[PDB]
Amino acid sequence: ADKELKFLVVDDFSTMRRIVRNLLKELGFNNVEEAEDGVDALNKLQAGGYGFVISDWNMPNMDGLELLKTIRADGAMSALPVLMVIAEAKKENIIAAAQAGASGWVVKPFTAATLEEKLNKIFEKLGM
């Protein structure tokens, strides 16, 4: 894909946002920024320039699935890739997420490799 795609890494656990940031990096993706919950996420997206959203599931104020749902229903941002970080392959959430428009999902913990194939297959399917 493109190495300067601007990524948005959304998570309530600063630790985990540190790991995503680094995972991206170690794959040559260094046009990244962070958001702490869905509310902050939306705020940043509206400003512009993003090309990929990596959002966790459990965040206060505005959670994972909500973030996903508002990008999808929002006509400006509607076709924006959203990769969702889900804890356990709880079938139920996988279904809600794909159901709500998520470009794909990854079960955390994930390595740089799984991340890289998750992205590559999202890139391929989105014409990226």
Side-chain angles (χ1 to χ4, degrees), residues 29-89 91-125:
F29 292 112
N30 322 257
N31 189 27
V32 181
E33 227 318 48
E34 299 162 1
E36 337 171 296
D37 51 59
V39 164
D40 176 25
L42 280 163
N43 299 348
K44 280 149 169 132
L45 301 165
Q46 286 155 346
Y50 291 91
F52 206 107
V53 171
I54 315 176
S55 188
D56 214 273
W57 191 261
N58 252 268
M59 323 169 273
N61 318 306
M62 191 195 320
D63 85 6
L65 185 64
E66 300 281 336
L67 178 56
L68 175 46
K69 303 200 263 175
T70 150
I71 289 168
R72 278 294 168 267
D74 181 323
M77 260 175 330
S78 100
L80 184 74
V82 180
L83 170 65
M84 307 295 325
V85 178
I86 95 149
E88 172 234 312
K91 304 224 186 214
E92 314 88 57
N93 295 342
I94 293 166
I95 302 214
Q99 217 344 320
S103 306
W105 76 92
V106 74
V107 192
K108 88 190 160 126
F110 69 88
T111 62
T114 95
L115 167 52
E116 195 170 51
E117 341 182 300
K118 284 318 186 134
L119 287 178
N120 298 338
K121 92 145 54 310
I122 296 199
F123 300 135
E124 287 161 30
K125 163 188 53 157

Side-chain angles (χ1 to χ4, degrees), residues 9-26 32-36 56 110 115:
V9 175
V10 191
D11 191 315
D12 175 72
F13 189 41
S14 59
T15 303
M16 177 54 185
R17 232 154 66 198
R18 180 161 279 66
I19 295 173
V20 179
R21 173 93 78 128
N22 302 153
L23 288 196
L24 276 175
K25 224 288 316 142
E26 97 226 354
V32 181
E33 227 318 48
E34 299 162 1
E36 337 171 296
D56 214 273
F110 69 88
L115 167 52

